Design a protein around this ligand. Sequence first.
Ligand code: 4FH
Ligand code: ZN
Length: 257
Amino acid sequence: HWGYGKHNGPEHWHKDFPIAKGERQSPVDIDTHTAKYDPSLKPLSVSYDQATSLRILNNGHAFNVEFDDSQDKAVLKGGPLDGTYRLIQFHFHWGSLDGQGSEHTVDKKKYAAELHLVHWNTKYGDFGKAVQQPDGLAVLGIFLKVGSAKPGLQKVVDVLDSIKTKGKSADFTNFDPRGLLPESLDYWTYPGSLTTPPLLECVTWIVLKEPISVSSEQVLKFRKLNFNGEGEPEELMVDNWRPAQPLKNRQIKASFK
Ligand SMILES: On1ccc(C(F)(F)F)cc1=S
Ligand SMILES: [Zn+2]
C-alpha cells in the first residue's frame, strides 16, 4: 500500500490515486515574490478556547491528535473562508534531518517539519460528506524550525513513546492546540488537496508565514516513531512529506503586505 519509501512513495501514488496528477494538488512552493497581497482577505479567526482533544493515534504514516468535533467547539473562520470549519485533528510531516521535512516550501526553502490542523466545513454535516466537496476542508499549515523548544508541544512529544508503532493509540485529553500557534496569523492561501492519499481536492490551504521554533530534542523524538507495526522490522517514521507539485492554473494570495 502507499507510503514514503522507494517503492511506494510519492512518485508511485498516481497509479492508485490518479488525482495525484490533478489540477489542484498539494503541497506547492510558495514563491513570495509572486504571491500577490489580497486586501479583500479577512483576518483569520482561530477559536480554539473550547477545543476538546480526545486521543493520539499512530496511523502508520504520521500521528493524529484527534478532537471531539460533535459540537462547534474549535473553529476556523474568516481569512479566505466562507462559513465555519470545525477542527477534527492535527498532525505533522517531518524529515530525517533538520534541513528537510516540510511539505510547502517558501522560495524553495524546506523547513524541518510542518503542522497541519485539519478542519471541515460544517455546511456539509460531517467530515465524510465534506471531503466530497471542493470547499469541504480548510487546513492551517504551520512550519517548524529547530531552535528554542516549544513548551506547548512537549505534552505531545512526551506521549510518543506510548504510540511508537502503527495502530497504537493513547488517551490524549485536555490538550490545548493554542500552544502550537506562532504570534502572527499572516498567511498565504491557495486551493489544493490532501497531501496524502487519497489526495482529495477539497482543501483551502492557509499557510502561516511565521514558523514556530521547536528544539532539536523535540524533533528527534518525532523521528523515533515507527511506520511499522508492533513486532515488525523497525522503519523509522521520518521523511513523511510529499514534495512540491506543479502550481498549474492557480494563484497564491498573501494576507499581508
Ligand atoms: O496529511 N494529511 C492527512 C490526512 C488529512 C485529512 F484531511 F484527511 F484529514 C489531511 C492531511 S494534510
Ligand atoms: Zn498533512
